[PDB]
Amino acid sequence: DRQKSSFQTRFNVHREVTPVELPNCNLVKGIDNGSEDLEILPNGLAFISSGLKYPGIMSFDPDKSGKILLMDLNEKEPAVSELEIIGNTLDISSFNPHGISTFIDDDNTVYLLVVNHPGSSSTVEVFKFQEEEKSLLHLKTIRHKLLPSVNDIVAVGPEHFYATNDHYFIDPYLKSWEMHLGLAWSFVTYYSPNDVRVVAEGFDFANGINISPDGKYVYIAELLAHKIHVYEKHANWTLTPLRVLSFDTLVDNISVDPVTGDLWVGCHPNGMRIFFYDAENPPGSEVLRIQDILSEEPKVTVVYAENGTVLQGSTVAAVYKGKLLIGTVFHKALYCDL
Numbered sequence: 001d002r003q004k005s006s007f008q009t010r011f012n013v014h015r016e017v018t019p020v021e022l023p024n025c026n027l028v029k030g031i032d033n034g035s036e037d038l039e040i041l042p043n044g045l046a047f048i049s050s051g052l053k054y055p056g057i058m059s060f061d062p063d064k065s066g067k068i069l070l071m072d073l074n075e076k077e078p079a080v081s082e083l084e085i086i087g088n089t090l091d092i093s094s095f096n097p098h099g100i101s102t103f104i105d106d107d108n109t110v111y112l113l114v115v116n117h118p119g120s121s122s123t124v125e126v127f128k129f130q131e132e133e134k135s136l137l138h139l140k141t142i143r144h145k146l147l148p149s150v151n152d153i154v155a156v157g158p159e160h161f162y163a164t165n166d167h168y169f170i171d172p173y174l175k176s177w178e179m180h181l182g183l184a185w186s187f188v189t190y191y192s193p194n195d196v197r198v199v200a201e202g203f204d205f206a207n208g209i210n211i212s213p214d215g216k217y218v219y220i221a222e223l224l225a226h227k228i229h230v231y232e233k234h235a236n237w238t239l240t241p242l243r244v245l246s247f248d249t250l251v252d253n254i255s256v257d258p259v260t261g262d263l264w265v266g267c268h269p270n271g272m273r274i275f276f277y278d279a280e281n282p283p284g285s286e287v288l289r290i291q292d293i294l295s296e297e298p299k300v301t302v303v304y305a306e307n308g309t310v311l312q313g314s315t316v317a318a319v320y321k322g323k324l325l326i327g328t329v330f331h332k333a334l335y336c337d338l
């Protein structure tokens with residue numbers, strides 16, 4: 001009976017959101033089947049993954065494929081366009097994109113890394129962004145025993161990244177049990193061409209992951225524990241615990257403002273509404289800002305929140321020059337003035 005009290009805190013079973021309004025929010029035209037992750041380059045180009053199919057999660061078009069979208073946030077009325085995937089090393093028909101990350105090389109080549117779930121497996125797909133042609137050149141499919149159930153990655157090189165696994169098991173049945181039981185066996189993996197190893201473990205659904213603009217610190221979101229973990233990142237790529245922030249919302253993906261180092265976090269206020277869909281009780285949205293995360297008292301602000309009648313199931317938010325872009329597991333996306 002301790003397993004029913006725990007399941008109910010973990011999943012925030014009776015929480016309701018306190019709305020926090022922003023002026024001039026607009027749904028992004030063309031985004032109606034998810035925008036689980038996104039990343040804004042310094043130049044204001046934004047990549048969005050959409051169409052995620054996740055075992056046991058709502059989907060309005062179970063049979064249409066995922067895609068990567070592009071938005072130019074320097075435009076005042078930004079429109080989304082579908083990036084074309086070129087290459088013969090990847091089967092696009094099964095494409096099911098999840099978390100993403102980018103890395104800009106010394107030569108200014110932009111690499112896009114994309115978590116992909118063809119079937120119940122996980123890969124990380126490496127693309128080279130071709131800006132002029134609005135297209136993604138496929139370079140490499142990455143798979144490993146230590147990338148069983150990848151949720152997000154943060155790129156530290158063109159085929160180098162830290163990855164969260166949100167489950168230990170691959171079989172959808174077992175990981176459903178693993179989640180309900182609260183085993184907390186999910187873990188974080190460092191991947192490079194030369195070395196692949198676990199760098200942190202024992203997580204209740206590890207989810208978002210990102211890095212400070214100076215590379216010194218790594219941030220890991222633990223969804224069902226409502227925690228964000230901070231780590232010291234050494235030059236040999238090991239991680240050592242430093243802090244743990246707690247929240248009373250389910251934290252999903254982390255974005256990092258390059259100018260300040262602030263974390264911007266997409267959150268699920270109520271775990272039941274996001275995990276067990278019900279078109280009559282849709283899940284809401286919530287966006288946190290965390291400032292001076294190393295200080296003794298970090299500043300945590302709710303910047304946007306709503307019960308779901310506009311935007312359902314916020315997973316990610318990032319800011320660009322006064323605007324805020326918010327994405328969701330399977331619903332729409334919102335572009336707001338701050």
Ligand SMILES: O=c1ccc2ccccc2[nH]1
Nearest residue numbers: 168184185186201202203
């Ligand atoms: O922290 C732990 C503890 C036990 C255990 C058993 C099987 C697999 C992973 C495990 N992790």
Ligand SMILES: O=c1ccc2ccccc2[nH]1
Nearest residue numbers: 054057151252274275329
């Ligand atoms: O990144 C993710 C992916 C799927 C998902 C499903 C339910 C709740 C949160 C989730 N987060």
Ligand SMILES: [Br-]
Nearest residue numbers: 169170171174
């Ligand atoms: Br398995």
Ligand SMILES: [Br-]
Nearest residue numbers: 269270283284
């Ligand atoms: Br909610």
Ligand SMILES: [Tb+3]
Nearest residue numbers: 099100101152
């Ligand atoms: Tb990401």
Ligand SMILES: [Tb+3]
Nearest residue numbers: 207208252253
């Ligand atoms: Tb996520």
